[PDB]
């Protein structure tokens, strides 16, 4: 999977993976 923050405020922090 890739890491690009799937549940963040914007989408550039990356606090998790699976999307
Ligand atoms: C360090 C900074 O600017 O914070 C980045 C985001 O706002 C972090 O917010 P958050 O931790 O509530 O969401 C997680 C980001 N996917």
Swiss-Prot record:
Cross-link Lysinoalanine (Ser-Lys) position reads 6-19
**(3R)-3-hydroxyaspartate is carried by which residues?**
15
Site of covalent link Beta-methyllanthionine (Cys-Thr): 1-18, 5-11
Regarding how it is modified after translation, the entry says:
Maturation of lantibiotics involves the enzymatic conversion of Thr, and Ser into dehydrated AA and the formation of thioether bonds with cysteine or the formation of dialkylamine bonds with lysine. This is followed by membrane translocation and cleavage of the modified precursor.
Sequence position, cross-link Lanthionine (Ser-Cys): 4-14
**Family of this protein:** Belongs to the type B lantibiotic family.
Its annotated function is as follows: Can act as inhibitor of the enzyme phospholipase A2, and of the angiotensin-converting enzyme. Shows inhibitory activities against herpes simplex virus and immunopotentiating activities. Its antimicrobial activities are not very pronounced.
What name has this protein been given in UniProt?
A: Lantibiotic cinnamycin
Parent-record interval covered: 60 to 78 of 78
